[PDB]
Amino acid sequence: PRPHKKLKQLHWEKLDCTDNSIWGTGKAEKFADDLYEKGVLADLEKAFAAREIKSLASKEFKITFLSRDISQQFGINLHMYSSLSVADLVKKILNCDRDFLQTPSVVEFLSKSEIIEVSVNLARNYAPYSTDWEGVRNLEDAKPPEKDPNDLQRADQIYLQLMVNLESYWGSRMRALTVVTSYEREYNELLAKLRKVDKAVSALQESDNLRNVFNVILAVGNFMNDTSKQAQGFKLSTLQRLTFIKDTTNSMTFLNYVEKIVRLNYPSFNDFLSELEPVLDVVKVSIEQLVNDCKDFSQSIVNVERSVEIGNLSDSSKFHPLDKVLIKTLPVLPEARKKGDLLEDEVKLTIMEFESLMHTYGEDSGDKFAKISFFKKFADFINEYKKAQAQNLAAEEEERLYIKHKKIVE
Amino acid sequence: PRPHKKLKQLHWEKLDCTDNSIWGTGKAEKFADDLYEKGVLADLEKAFAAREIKSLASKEFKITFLSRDISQQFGINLHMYSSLSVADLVKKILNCDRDFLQTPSVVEFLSKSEIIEVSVNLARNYAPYSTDWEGVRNLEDAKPPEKDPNDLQRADQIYLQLMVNLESYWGSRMRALTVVTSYEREYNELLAKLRKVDKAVSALQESDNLRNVFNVILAVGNFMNDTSKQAQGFKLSTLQRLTFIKDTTNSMTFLNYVEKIVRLNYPSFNDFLSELEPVLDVVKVSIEQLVNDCKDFSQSIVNVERSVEIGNLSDSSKFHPLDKVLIKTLPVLPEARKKGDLLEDEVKLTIMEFESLMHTYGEDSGDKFAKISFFKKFADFINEYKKAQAQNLAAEEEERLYIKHKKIVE
Numbered sequence: 129p130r131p132h133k134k135l136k137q138l139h140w141e142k143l144d145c146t147d148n149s150i151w152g153t154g155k156a157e158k159f160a161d162d163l164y165e166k167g168v169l170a171d172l173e174k175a176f177a178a179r180e181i182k183s184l185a186s187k188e189f190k191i192t193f194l195s196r197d198i199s200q201q202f203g204i205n206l207h208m209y210s211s212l213s214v215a216d217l218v219k220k221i222l223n224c225d226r227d228f229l230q231t232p233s234v235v236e237f238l239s240k241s242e243i244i245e246v247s248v249n250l251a252r253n254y255a256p257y258s259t260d261w262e263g264v265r266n267l268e269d270a271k272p273p274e275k276d277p278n279d280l281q282r283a284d285q286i287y288l289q290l291m292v293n294l295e296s297y298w299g300s301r302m303r304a305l306t307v308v309t310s311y312e313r314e315y316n317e318l319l320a321k322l323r324k325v326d327k328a329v330s331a332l333q334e335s336d337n338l339r340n341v342f343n344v345i346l347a348v349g350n351f352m353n354d355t356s357k358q359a360q361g362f363k364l365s366t367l368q369r370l371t372f373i374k375d376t377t378n379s380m381t382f383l384n385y386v387e388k389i390v391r392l393n394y395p396s397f398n399d400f401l402s403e404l405e406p407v408l409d410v411v412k413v414s415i416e417q418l419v420n421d422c423k424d425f426s427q428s429i430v431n432v433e434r435s436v437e438i439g440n441l442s443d444s445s446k447f448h449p450l451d452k453v454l455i456k457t458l459p460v461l462p463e464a465r466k467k468g469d470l471l472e473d474e475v476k477l478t479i480m481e482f483e484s485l486m487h488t489y490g491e492d493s494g495d496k497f498a499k500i501s502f503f504k505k506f507a508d509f510i511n512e513y514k515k516a517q518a519q520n521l522a523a524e525e526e527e528r529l530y531i532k533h534k535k536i537v538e
Numbered sequence: 539p540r541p542h543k544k545l546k547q548l549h550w551e552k553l554d555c556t557d558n559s560i561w562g563t564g565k566a567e568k569f570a571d572d573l574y575e576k577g578v579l580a581d582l583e584k585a586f587a588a589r590e591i592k593s594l595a596s597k598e599f600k601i602t603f604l605s606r607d608i609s610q611q612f613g614i615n616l617h618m619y620s621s622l623s624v625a626d627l628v629k630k631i632l633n634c635d636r637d638f639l640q641t642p643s644v645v646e647f648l649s650k651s652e653i654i655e656v657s658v659n660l661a662r663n664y665a666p667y668s669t670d671w672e673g674v675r676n677l678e679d680a681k682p683p684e685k686d687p688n689d690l691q692r693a694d695q696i697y698l699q700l701m702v703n704l705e706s707y708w709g710s711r712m713r714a715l716t717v718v719t720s721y722e723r724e725y726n727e728l729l730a731k732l733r734k735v736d737k738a739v740s741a742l743q744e745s746d747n748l749r750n751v752f753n754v755i756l757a758v759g760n761f762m763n764d765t766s767k768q769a770q771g772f773k774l775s776t777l778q779r780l781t782f783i784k785d786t787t788n789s790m791t792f793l794n795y796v797e798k799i800v801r802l803n804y805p806s807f808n809d810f811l812s813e814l815e816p817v818l819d820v821v822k823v824s825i826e827q828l829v830n831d832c833k834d835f836s837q838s839i840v841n842v843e844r845s846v847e848i849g850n851l852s853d854s855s856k857f858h859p860l861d862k863v864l865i866k867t868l869p870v871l872p873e874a875r876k877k878g879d880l881l882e883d884e885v886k887l888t889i890m891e892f893e894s895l896m897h898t899y900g901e902d903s904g905d906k907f908a909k910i911s912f913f914k915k916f917a918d919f920i921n922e923y924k925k926a927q928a929q930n931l932a933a934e935e936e937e938r939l940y941i942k943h944k945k946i947v948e
Contacts, residue, residue: 129761131761136762136783137762137763137764137767138759138762138763138767138783138792139779139782140759140773140775140776141772141773141776142767142769142770142772142773143769143772148897148898149771149898149899149900150749150752150771150898151770151771152770155750155753156753156756156770157757159753159754159757160758160760163757163758163799163803166803168802168803169761172758172761172799175785175786175795176762176783176785176786176792177786248778248918251778251779251782252781252782255782255783299907339560340565342560343560343563343565343566344569346561347569347570347573348579349548350570351539351541351570351579351582352545352546352582352586353547353548354547355540357547357548359552359553360552360553360555360556360561360562360566361552361553361560361561362550362551362552363551363552363553365550365551366550368658369550369661371662372661372662372665373546373548373665375585376585376586385582389578392578393573393576393578434904439902487558488558488559488560489559490559494844497709508658
């Protein structure tokens with residue numbers, strides 16, 4: 129069954145070929161005809177029909193449906209292109225021009241959720257100005273204007289031409305492009321932020337000075353404890369609590385002693401304060417986070433790949449005739465995935481080392497708590513010492529300028 | 539080497555028996571003696587010694603080191619026990635008394651991070667009033683008061699007696715207890731919130747009415763489209779866009795037609811609005827979240843188990859003589875893990891069904907986007923109809939009270 133004249137064409141996404149669904153039955157016909165015979169259908173032959181002449185006649189208006197909020201961001205985030213025309217601008221993006229890709233401010237923007245997310249409402253309004261492109265290989269071929277976007281502001285015109293007509297894959301277009309111009313950095317940033325953990329590990333690992341100080345502390349300890357607490361060693365918890373027991377004058381704490389009881393007798397040890405340098409350089413790094421930042425770095429690539437292979441980028445016809453996303457991603461992905469793995473190891477490696485070091489000091493390793501605070505406990509203690517020592521360097525040159533002065537007076 | 543008198547005992551966590559660490563060497567001795575011969579050690583024999591008489595003499599003061607903020611929460615969150623004495627209160631918790639466990643307000647509180655987390659500082663201050671318990675089986679045996687907590691406020695006294703002396707395992711004591719009195723609920727809440735997804739699934743699954751309406755829509759569609767868009771079916775995206783094409787009077791949209799073109803000819807279909815009831819009852823449920831809420835429900839148990847087996851609850855001596863955490867958990871855990879699995883399946887099952895239904899309607903299933911919005915798209919459309927129909931029920935009784943009235947006037 130067919131009408132007789134030009135009717136309003138319906139813009140929809142069909143299932144290319146009848147799949148394993150609710151389709152196939154054929155009731156699509158047992159109905160089509162059934163509605164034509166009963167005439168009802170015929171009604172629709174009317175009530176729905178094409179339009180004609182109306183030309184331009186620049187209303188003198190200009191509209192916008194966007195939050196005044198949004199409308200603002202497009203003029204801001206996209207100012208360096210104020211000089212270009214909407215038409216000549218979408219061209220700048222669709223083609224993925226050098227200056228565009230090298231500008232994060234933009235990519236980040238063209239990708240913000242709140243900018244792509246399109247309300248049922250918002251869509252409805254534009255519909256009359258939209259376009260399909262799905263099944264369109266050239267710009268001159270897409271004819272259906274439906275109305276005219278020039279009757280919209282630069283803002284809306286953009287928003288439409290992009291997050292609207294290409295809603296079919298925008299998010300996923302950008303979600304890739306973001307990576308296509310990033311992994312490199314993301315990698316480096318990540319990797320370096322990773323080197324800085326091994327270093328901090330190595331130090332603790334190979335630096336007997338510390339180990340020594342520890343025994344000295346152990347030694348003293350055993351002594352200072354009654355006939356029973358004959359300890360073979362202590363857990364790290366203890367380092368913080370060395371500044372807990374003060375003398376009798378409440379002037380210097382047990383730690384102060386140690387530091388001196390060390391610099392006075394085996395001053396060859398205090399080289400450790402300069403050896404655990406990195407352990408302080410990276411006590412800031414959330415181990416956990418760093419792990420995940422990577423888990424996600426890799427994951428992020430897996431995704432763009434999937435979308436390229438069987439997702440929203442898997443089908444080319446759907447793209448805007450002038451879109452060049454694939455031609456800018458297909459080549460990169462391997463370079464990326466490559467880094468993806470490279471990094472993946474650096475982790476699984478670094479981590480084990482860390483986990484090992486933990487065991488060495490008796491600290492747990494399966495427990496989350498510990499994993500975080502570990503590095504800290506050392507860094508802390510190191511600062512606890514440093515400070516505690518600068519205090520021992522005063523008392524020396526104090527009962528020095530009083531006993532080198534209680535004599536030149538008697 | 540040993541001193542000669544009573545020295546200040548050092549509170550530390552030793553490594554029970556020399557392990558695979560930096561301990562064993564024996565330098566703990568090559569130092570101990572070495573410092574005694576050089577006399578230096580001897581010095582420490584002094585500068586550090588016991589105390590004597592000072593008795594009570596209730597200063598008339600009373601101190602607090604806690605943020606005024608914190609101090610507030612203890613009086614609040616713990617008001618129902620205002621009537622009890624600090625001593626008789628810690629007893630109420632350590633023993634895990636019925637009325638205590640059945641009171642979330644409390645458990646939640648005694649477990650807040652910001653309440654357990656103890657600053658280097660905060661610890662130092664209390665140290666003089668603390669206690670060890672590690673290696674203590676009776677309350678009368680723990681003698682070392684070190685000072686006197688009665689010189690502290692109810693607040694601090696609590697905080698000390700608990701998050702302080704039992705810092706060695708508190709968090710992990712509570713982290714369990716929280717579960718010991720929860721999984722039950724957590725389960726039920728979770729499960730029910732899960733039943734509500736299957737129901738919403740089943741409906742979409744077995745309800746031909748919808749399927750029909752869909753074809754009707756397909757039928758009309760094919761017709762309304764030129765000699766080429768011979769579609770076998772459409773993707774869900776389309777449901778929202780049916781309210782996109784309006785007639786010529788811009789009064790009723792393509793959807794309005796459909797609804798009527800349906801209630802007029804096969805009004806046996808509109809039973810679907812009452813059939814996809816649950817699809818609306820649960821369009822609120824974040825599928826993703828719900829999945830994880832469970833992933834975490836199970837995980838939460840794995841944890842308490844680990845901690846019971848080889849963690850901070852693995853060793854009993856470390857607990858306060860009157861603590862009864864294990865005696866209240868060991869028995870429950872299986873009941874829990876049991877639920878853990880039970881639930882675990884309900885999920886892996888429910889999910890597959892959902893994933894299946896998605897495929898049926900041609901919607902993706904690996905993609906995250908879809909998983910979320912799916913249910914919605916249907917629920918939406920259902921509301922799009924409902925509304926759109928109530929509008930068709932006006933135009934009927936409108937061109938009815940005008941043509942049943944344009945006659946009784948001529």
